[PDB]
Design a protein around this ligand. Sequence first.
Ligand code: HEC
Ligand code: HEC
Ligand code: HEC
Ligand code: HEC
Ligand SMILES: [Ca+2]
Ligand SMILES: [Ca+2]
Lengths: 317, 317
Amino acid sequence: DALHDQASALFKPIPEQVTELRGQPISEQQRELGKKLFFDPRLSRSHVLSCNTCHNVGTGGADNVPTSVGHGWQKGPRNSPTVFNAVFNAAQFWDGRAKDLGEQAKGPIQNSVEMHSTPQLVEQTLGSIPEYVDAFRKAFPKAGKPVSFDNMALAIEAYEATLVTPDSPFDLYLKGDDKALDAQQKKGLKAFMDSGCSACHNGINLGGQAYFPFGLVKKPDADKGRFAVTKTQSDEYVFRAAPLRNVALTAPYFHSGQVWELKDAVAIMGNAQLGKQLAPDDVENIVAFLHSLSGKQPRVEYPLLPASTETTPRPAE
Amino acid sequence: DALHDQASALFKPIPEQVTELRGQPISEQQRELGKKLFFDPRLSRSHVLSCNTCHNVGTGGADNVPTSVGHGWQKGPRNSPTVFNAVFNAAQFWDGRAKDLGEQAKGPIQNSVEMHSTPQLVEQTLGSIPEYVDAFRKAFPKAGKPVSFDNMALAIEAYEATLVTPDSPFDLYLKGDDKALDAQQKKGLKAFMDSGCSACHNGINLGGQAYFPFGLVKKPDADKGRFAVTKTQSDEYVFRAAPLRNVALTAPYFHSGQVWELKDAVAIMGNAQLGKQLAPDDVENIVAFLHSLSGKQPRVEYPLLPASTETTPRPAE
Ligand code: HEC
Ligand code: HEC
Ligand code: HEC
Ligand code: HEC
Ligand SMILES: [Ca+2]
Ligand SMILES: [Ca+2]
């Protein structure tokens, strides 16, 4: 089918599982340790914030509130992006100055820990708990200092690699099953490509691979009649093309989390003059199409975190 | 064994499972629905607080920070008590005036919802989500209005009944296995009874059944040399005798969450003039004994919460 043809040229399905990371095989110990860390609020100085707090695995992997402030890169509050399938994103943050985005040498993990705690503090904390000490040795055998920021980061990435959502209808369609998407979804997929959406939203995650000088702003006054995606003040200031997988599960939308309905988000983008102007039917069909991007949500067994000991730092500001 | 004799007269083990609640059998649908609600942050107006936030199932069922404010009964901030085995507690809150505690007609669930949201709001919220609507009908078939505060409360209680921790060593010892507790733990159990601890901390949960006019205060200046448990300003003002099950997992201690070490908490209580003055060995042995109260932690599969719809109220203050 010609439709399946161009689809396959532009998109790729989520693998059933990633087994290697940074050229290293992912062990189960690493996965388990990473899970604990992802849920342990003790990584925050205050002992109340965990990755799961803002990237809630029960609600699409995002907190689903307008904005929050979790990473040091942030110049301000932004909508928390889902953590599902994030491992495939080359472009990680929402926005930034092009020169600075070539200076954000830091990844999400280091960014967050430095913001809500300090690496030294996090190390001292994990070190005071025997169960963690052991878990680290068992997961990183050939290591001098098993409990170190580096390994912690590696462990979390391993768990992150576990949070993928394969087998969404769209993916089944890409893999072959031409019955996966209904007619409306197909008109949508067609319109998505025809209107130039795929110009920016492409690849495995339908986005998350590049930055562009367009961002949502509240109109000076000219949802879909209150906000618009326009050029930034200079092409040096860019926003990441949001990866669309599981988009139906992570409202509100855009970096500021200001539009709550997907139909509006679609209309707004389809009015950004970044392609052929959209027709009502298209907007509807596209939305239907987007729903086909919801994959299989990860089944997570809440980890049992080890108890603090007498040398474990106590909460603070 | 004489020791096992008085032990059995004063204590009782946690049943393997509670199957009935308010004279009604607990179905699995109720359990599942309750689990979702316990983790759904949308029960708070702001969409950021869930029961799990403060009664974290991964860390002993408590948040393990000095204090928090989660229920309307609260006159101030208090340490969040564990939710594990709470269903067996007759006395639910930390403290209060005797006359008012005969007016706290409200339970933890209603107290919390009224504080962080409103019953009407919570009802409107759950009602806007089809998956919940259905889950409610399947869990409460013979019901006029399936989605109602009442049923929500019932569902959560059902899930609460699931959060019990049977088979702690102490319990195995009570059930017979005289090898469950080592010699030190036995000296501890003996001392616990001999020093009058069991006068207040008894029953299935070693506490949580009655109120007494003694509470921790910071000495005017006379941990164990900075705080003390003394009489309240009048026997009308009382504090609940904290249930001790899983106590080794829920530091800090006392209603204000001011003492971090169990040895100190024990010393302080064993100096309250509520029994024979404790000897260093005893304090150590008792602590060892308390550790025998950590039961089997519940294995929880994080629930997949349904997506908000267009009629679902948006976050607020
Ligand atoms: C709320 C206070 C958060 C906490 C705690 C954590 N994260 Fe986060 N994360 C948050 C926001 C608001 C954002 C966007 C920031 C921006 O300006 O871009 C993020 C982003 C990430 C990302 C990048 C997403 C991608 O697709 O590459 C990742 C992967 C991520 N966060 C992971 C994560 C982990 C592992 C955390 C605990 C160590 C962590 N975040 C904490 C907000 C919050
Ligand atoms: C490149 C210039 C783009 C084209 C072509 C389209 N989109 Fe896009 N999209 C782009 C950016 C820079 C952003 C973020 C803007 C911001 O201020 O945050 C987005 C975001 C979306 C979203 C929101 C997803 C989310 O918040 O998780 C949707 C739903 C979306 N885009 C859809 C979409 C459609 C349907 C398009 C063509 C009809 C389209 N976008 C084109 C960049 C680009
Ligand atoms: C933090 C902001 C909390 C949230 C949200 C919830 N709870 Fe809570 N709970 C909290 C505290 C600080 C306390 C002590 C209050 C006091 O003054 O006594 C509690 C207490 C309870 C109890 C009673 C414990 C017992 O053994 O009987 C229960 C059972 C309980 N909380 C349950 C619970 C549920 C089901 C919640 C969500 C609907 C809930 N709490 C929210 C703090 C917090
Ligand atoms: C009845 C008057 C009591 C006697 C006898 C003992 N305890 Fe107790 N205990 C009691 C109260 C009213 C409280 C709460 C005081 C407050 O300000 O919060 C407690 C609490 C404890 C704790 C803390 C548990 C927790 O915070 O989760 C411990 C560890 C404890 N009590 C132990 C203990 C021991 C070992 C006793 C005899 C040697 C003892 N208590 C006696 C009431 C009473
Ligand atoms: Ca979002
Ligand atoms: Ca406590």
